[PDB]
């Protein structure tokens, strides 16, 4: 029978390479971090007609919905052969969960008179995430620091290891960073040092950097943001 895992992802514009999709990147990262053998098939145009292309076969069985695939992988790939990637702190699963939605409304808005509201809503969401990244978690200890630790030095959302929460959020933050810069000259504010520490830590991980689609894929996917504000 069909055995193993195949992840089907959106193809880029060349019809063969990885295209823009935060959901595909999320699953790519999970499978990488699991240490499981898998292949990635790009989709270039028993599964329903026109199902949206981030899906997976597991021993031949088709699995849909990015959230359900995550839950299935975390439940089927377990120690000792595969690590658990679930978070230890429940707040890690909700931190910044509105950021991508607010960015989407900001970047898709056409009316200039509404930009201040959408941009401020984005900044408010980012502030909340930055606060979580900079506030030490309760169990956090800096064993090597004689001084008191007021700004968290942990690498990622939940601690020093990448978890499912990072696989969800990091692809979205990567899109925001590329698109908002290209089309709005908008950047994560310099005072949000938690977001910037987090991104610097993440871009130093092969599992994040080498699952990012090319910048031009992401910029092309959002090419409608180059239109004038009416």
Residue numbers in the entry: 359 to 403, 412 to 596
Sentences from the paper on this structure:
Additional to the canonical GST-Ω class carboxy-terminal CLIC domain, CLIC6 endows a unique amino-terminal, predicted to be highly flexible, which exhibits poor sequence similarity to any known protein. Hence, in order to gain molecular insights into the metamorphic nature of the canonical CLIC domain of mouse CLIC6, we purified and analyzed its conserved CLIC module (mCLIC6; residues 363–597). mCLIC6 was highly soluble in solution and crystallized using standard techniques.
We report the crystal structure of the mouse CLIC6 canonical CLIC domain at 1.8 Å resolution, which reveals high homology to the canonical structures observed in other CLIC family members. The structure of mCLIC6 has been determined from two crystal forms at 1.8 Å (P 21) and 1.9 Å (C 1 2 1) resolution, respectively. The overall structure, in both crystal forms, shows two nearly identical mCLIC6 subunits forming the asymmetric unit, each with 55 × 46 × 26 Å3 approximate dimensions. Comparison of the relative chain conformations within the asymmetric unit yielded a root mean square deviation (r.m.s.d for all 226 Cα atoms) of 1.7 Å. However, overlaying the TRX or the α helical domains separately resulted in significantly superior alignments, with r.m.s.d of 0.6 Å and 0.5 Å, respectively, indicating an intrinsic inter-domain flexibility leading to structural plasticity. While this interface demonstrates highly hydrophobic surface properties, close inspection of its structure revealed a single inter-domain hydrogen bond, bridging the putative transmembrane region (PTM; helix α1), localized to the TRX domain (Q383), and the C-terminal end of helix α8 of the α domain (T577).
